[PDB]
Design a protein. Structure first.
Length: 483
């Protein structure tokens, strides 16, 4: 009957202890806390972008203007509004002003190919009003009278794992509030802190930096694109900007480790890197704490976008030098289960598919089919029927120090990741094959491309950036005669 039916008491007890995660957080809802910070700290810097710094007063003023504009053009609460994700100031007033309108923002990269932007507008139900006009130069205005309704939708963020099947994750306020409380409390975020935003706003780790900043009075510091590509300049930039909290995907951090081994760094202001996405190992994290002088602790996380950025966490020990780092214990009010093909809860030590429950779950996808294939109800213990999200990820429950912990084990469809983004090998093969003049193409991750045909690698470069996002156009494009 139940998913734990076959377990012995000791094995069922391990799972019960692991998911003993309930925590009640105080204060009003998320947006209200953001407004209280604007009242308490109007003169503090709230966002530091590439074209300037905005105080909390200016940020909420500009956001107010955005929300009044949206009301003036018939955008009622519960609508979805696109915002141009850039590294400038404008997008922050856009996304905040959308939220004050009682709406949800869908982040769009304006450099992305137009065909993919059109899909996202259509699938999100999103108006492009704020893509067509400059959100920061809208006429000043008070915010409109939007009542507070509980668990409103905050964002639709797109995950592009399946080719021709981008999925729009719909995320509501309780999940984002719960995440924000965790980030602030777990990492001791304070008004004087400076939170780096490495992820663009199209990638949900930006969420984990922006709202904990704005819910505390800390400063959100967006990491400029030219700085992120150069691991050396990035390390210098973290010191010059006195960043206290940073987000990275595992592969990006490995680059920083390489750049740190070549030129060891002092980062006295850094207290936290929240890092995750791919499996990594204690011999790497030991190497890091060797060439980096810093109080920064590494917080390894795991989580799909479908469960509000992060679902598990592990404080990474700097003494250990061997073995795989575990993804750790669930975030507050999260609950995770390792299930087999049959839906039975795996004994400790046995690899299963992660299903996620609790306060972090999306409402679902915009697509009904995708929602029905991934969210489901299961009675996992006697008397506990969970709404679950089926991740596609494998993990086992292990003993790590005094605690039960999950250890990541792979995927069921094991696709590759590039700069933290799940992508299929077969989409970049079809994209270069579809360039008229090119023929066969093989793409390997070393992202390198070998293709047959007489399109010089410059004209191919130009045709690919018009078709693919900037992160899927291969780093090398080598013309070859046969495969
Ligand atoms: N915080 C964090 N979470 C995950 C992310 N939500 C994802 O789906 O890739 C990996 C990178 N960083």
């Amino acid at each position: 009957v139940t998913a734990d039916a076959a377990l012995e008491p000791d094995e069922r007890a391990a799972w019960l202890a692991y998911n003993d995660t309930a925590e009640d957080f105080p204060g009003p809802h998320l947006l209200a806390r953001l407004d209280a910070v604007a009242r308490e700290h109007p003169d503090r810097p709230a966002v530091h972008a590439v074209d300037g710094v905005w105080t909390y007063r200016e940020l909420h003023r500009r956001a107010d203007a955005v929300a009044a504009f949206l009301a003036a053009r018939g955008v009622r609460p519960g609508s979805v509004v696109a915002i141009a994700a850039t590294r400038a100031l404008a997008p922050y007033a856009a996304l905040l002003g959308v939220l004050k309108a009682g709406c949800a923002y869908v982040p769009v990269n304006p450099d992305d190919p137009a065909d993919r932007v059109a899909f996202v507008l259509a699938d999100a139900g999103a108006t492009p009003l704020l893509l067509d006009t400059d959100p920061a130069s809208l006429p000043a205005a008070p915010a409109p009278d939007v009542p507070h309704e509980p668990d409103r939708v905050c964002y639709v963020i797109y995950t592009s794992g399946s080719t021709g099947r981008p999925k729009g994750v719909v995320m509501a306020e309780r999940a984002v509030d719960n995440l924000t409380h965790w980030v602030v409390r777990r990492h001791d975020v304070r008004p004087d802190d400076r939170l780096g935003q490495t992820a663009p706003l199209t990638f949900d780790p930006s969420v984990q930096q922006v709202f904990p900043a704005w819910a505390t009075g800390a400063c959100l510091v967006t990491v400029p694109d030219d700085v992120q590509r150069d691991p050396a300049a990035f390390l210098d930039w973290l010191r010059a900007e006195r960043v206290t909290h940073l987000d990275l995907v595992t592969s990006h951090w490995v680059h920083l480790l390489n750049a740190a081994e070549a030129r060891p760094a002092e980062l006295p202001d850094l207290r936290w890197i929240i890092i995750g996405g791919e499996t990594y190992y204690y011999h790497q994290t030991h190497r890091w704490h060797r060439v980096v002088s810093s109080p920064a602790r590494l917080n390894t996380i795991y989580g799909p976008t479908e469960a509000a950025v992060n679902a598990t966490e592990h404080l990474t020990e700097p003494d250990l030098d061997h073995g795989q780092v575990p993804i750790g214990v669930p975030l507050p009010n999260y609950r995770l289960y390792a299930l087999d093909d049959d839906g039975r809860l795996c004994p400790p030590g046995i690899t299963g598919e992660i299903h996620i429950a609790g306060a972090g779950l999306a409402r679902g996808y915009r697509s009904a089919e995708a929602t029905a294939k991934a969210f489901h109800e299961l009675e996992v213990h006697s008397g506990r029927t969970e709404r679950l999200y089926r991740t596609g990820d494998l993990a086992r429950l292990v003993r790590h120090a005094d605690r039960w912990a999950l250890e990541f084990q792979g995927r069921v469809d094991s696709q590759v990741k590039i700069s933290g983004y799940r992508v299929e090998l077969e989409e970049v093969d079809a994209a270069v094959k579809a360039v008229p003049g090119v023929r066969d193409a093989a793409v390997v991750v070393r992202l390198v491309c070998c293709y047959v045909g007489d399109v010089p690698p410059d004209r191919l470069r130009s045709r690919l950036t018009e078709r693919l996002p900037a992160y899927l156009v291969p780093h090398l494009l080598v013309p070859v005669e046969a495969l």
